[model samples]
Target: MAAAAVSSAKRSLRGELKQRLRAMSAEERLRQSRVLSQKVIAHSEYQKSKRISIFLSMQDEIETEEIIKDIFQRGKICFIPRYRFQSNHMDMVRIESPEEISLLPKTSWNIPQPGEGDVREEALSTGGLDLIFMPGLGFDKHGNRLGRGKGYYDAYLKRCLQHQEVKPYTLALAFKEQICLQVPVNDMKVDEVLYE
Candidate 1:
C-alpha cells in the first residue's frame, strides 16, 4: 500500500539524515538554523500573516522569536505552542510579552512548555490563527515534512482541519541543506516550505 511505502522510505531517509545531523557540531547547527529563520521571515507569505502560530526552538530548530517580536510590534497577534499533559496535545497561547512565558517542566522529549494555568484552553483553540510556522528535522521542496519522531504537529494539524473554525496555513521552515532530493513524503504533508 501507499502507507507502507511511505513508512519504509521515511525510515530509510531518517536514518541517513540523523547520522548526518549528528556529525554536525553545535555551532554549525545554530548558524544554519539562524540563516534559515531569517530566510523564512523575509518571505512575503510569512510577513502578511495577521496571526501566526509558531514553536519555541529547543535545539537546532529555526529560532523565530525575533520575527515574532517584529510581528508583535506591528500589532499582530503571535501565538506559541503550550503543551498540555492532560490532552497530550499542544495549544497556542498568544504571547504579548516575554514575561508571559513561564518556562516550567519540559515535556517527555525535553522540550520546554508554558505553564498550564497561565493560558486559557478555549483561547488557544479558538484563536484565529492565520498561519502556523512549523519546525521539522527535515523537509523536501515538495512540502513533505519530517518531525522529531513525534506526531504532535501532525495530529494537531489534523484536528485543526476537522474543526470548521480553524483556517491556518501550515508552513515548514528549514535550511536549504536540509532539503534532499530523496526526502520521504509522509502522510502529514505541509502546505508549503521555506528555506535559506
Candidate 2:
C-alpha cells in the first residue's frame, strides 16, 4: 500500500538520520545549532512574526533553546507544543519565558511540553501564530520533510491550514546531515526551510 511505502521510507530515513545526529559531538551540535538559530532569527519571517511556535530540542537535534529564549527576550509571544500521546494530539501553547522550560516534565522522547501553567487552548493554538519553527529529522532542497513517523506536524498543519483565521508561516530547520536531497515535492508541506 502507499501508506506502507511512505512508512518504510520514513523508518529508513529516521534510522539514518538518528544515527548521524547521535554521532555528532556535543560541541559540534551546539556550535552548529547556534549558527542555524541565528539564521532563523535574522530571517524575514522571524522578524515579522509576533507569535511563534518552536519545538524543544532533543539531545541529537538542533538546539532550539536559544531560539525560544531569544523570541521571549524580544517580547514576542512564544508557544511550544503540548502533546497528548494517547490521542496523538498536539497544540501550540504559549510560554512567556524560556526559563520555564526547566520546570516542565519531559516527555518520553526527552522533549519538554507545556505541562503546567497557562496554555491558550480555548481557540486555535495561541489563537494562531505568526510562524512555526517546525521540527523534523530530515528535509530536502524542495522542502519535503521526514518526521519520526508520528505525522504530528502534518496533522497539525492540516488542521490549521483548513482554518481560515489561522495562517502561520511554517519553516523547517535542520543541520547538514538532516538534509535529504532525495525528498520530493508533495511528500510534505512547508513555506520554507533553513538548514546549515
Candidate 3:
C-alpha cells in the first residue's frame, strides 16, 4: 500500500536529517535560530495574530525562546504545546509569561512542557489559535514537513480545522541544514518554512 511505502521513505529521510542536524555546532545552531526567530516576529501573520501556538524546541530543533518572549512583549496571547505521553493528545494552552517557561518539567523527549497537574485555558476551547509556529526535523521548499512521527501536530491541526472554519496559519522554523530537496507530502504540511 502507499501508506507503507510513504512511511518507509519517511523513516530513512528522517534518519538523514537527524545526522545532518547533529553535525551542526551549537553556536551556529543558536545563531540560525535567533535569525529565524527575528524573521517570524517581523512576519505579517505574527504581527496580526493575537493568539499563537509555538512548540517548545528540543535540543537540535530551532530555539523558540525569542519568539515566545516577543509574544509576551507585544501583549499577544501566547500558547505552548502541552503534550500527553503514551498518546498523541496535545493541547495548546495559554502561558502567561516568559518566566513560566523555565518552571515547566522536561518531557522524556527533553522538551520543557507543563506538568500534568497544571491547568490552563485551551486555545481551541475558547477561540482557535490565529497561528501555530511548528517545529520539525526536515522540511522541503514546498513546505512539506517531517515531524518525529508522533502525529501530534498532524492531529492537532485537524482539531483546529474541526473547531473553526478558518484553520490557523501554520509556519515552521527550521535550521538551514534541515532544508531538503523533497519531503513526502501529507495532509499535515506547513504553509511556510522560516530558515536562516
Candidate 4:
C-alpha cells in the first residue's frame, strides 16, 4: 500500500538530487572532496581502522583519490567493490596499491573495478572490514541514504552481519548540495554522513 508511494517519492528525490549535484562546478566539488577526505583521515575511526572498503567514485560522487592514497600510506588494508552487473552481488576485494587502480577496467558507470578474471583476497573471507565508505545520491541528517536504485549496499551490509557479529562502521561522503531535508526510509542506514 504505502510502499509504492515511498518508492515513487524516492525516485523523484533521486532525480532532484542528481540535478543538485550536477549544478556544482567541478572545482567546487574537488574542493569539497578534499575537505571531506581530510575529515575522514583525521577521524578516530579512520585512524583506528586496519581494514576498510571504499567505493571508486563516479562523476557526481565524492572523489576518493586522496583517501585511497592515505590508506596505503598508513598501511591499512584496502578493499574495493567488484559488482556483478545486472545482479545485487558485490564483493569487497583487497587492493594492493594506488597504482593498481589504473590497471582495472571501467564499468558501465565509468567506475573502475577488477576484471572478471582477476582474483583477489575478499574482505569477508580474509578478514572483515573495520569500516565501509558508502556512495549514494542523497543522504539526510538522520542517516537515511538514497542509493542509485541499487540493492548492492543493502545486501552487502546484510552479508557483513552474517559474516561477523560486529557491524562495520558505515560512512558516507557528500557535497553540501547532496544533503537532503529528508530521504525515504530504508532498511540500511549509514552510521554517519560527512559533508563539506
Judging by TM-score against the true structure, name the best candidate.
4
TM-score order of candidates, best first?
A: 4, 3, 2, 1
RMSD of 3: 1.1
Over 4 Å off, model 4:
none
Q: Rank by lDDT, highest first.
A: 4, 3, 2, 1
Identify the leading candidate in terms of lDDT. Answer: 4
Model 3 TM-score on a 0 to 1 scale: 0.96
Which pairs clash in model 1?
A: none
**lDDT of candidate 4 over 80-150, digit per residue (tens):** 99999867699999989999999889888888899889988999998798999999999999998999997
Worst window of 10 by summed lDDT in candidate 2 = 117-126
Off by over 4 Å in 2: 116-126, 184-187
**Tens-digit lDDT track of model 3 for 36-114:** 8879878999999999998888889998889888899999998888888867799998889999888888888888788
User: Model 3 clash pairs?
Assistant: none
Error of 2 at 173 (Å): 1.2
Compared with the true structure, what per-residue lDDT tens digits does model 1 show for residues 93-173?
Answer: 676765455445566767656665654543245655678888887887778788766578888787676554656788887
Error of 4 at 98 (Å): 0.5
Q: What is the lDDT of residue 127 in candidate 3?
A: 89
- Model 2: which residue pairs collide? none
Clashes (N, CA, C under 3 Å) per candidate: 0, 0, 0, 0
lDDT of 1: 0.71
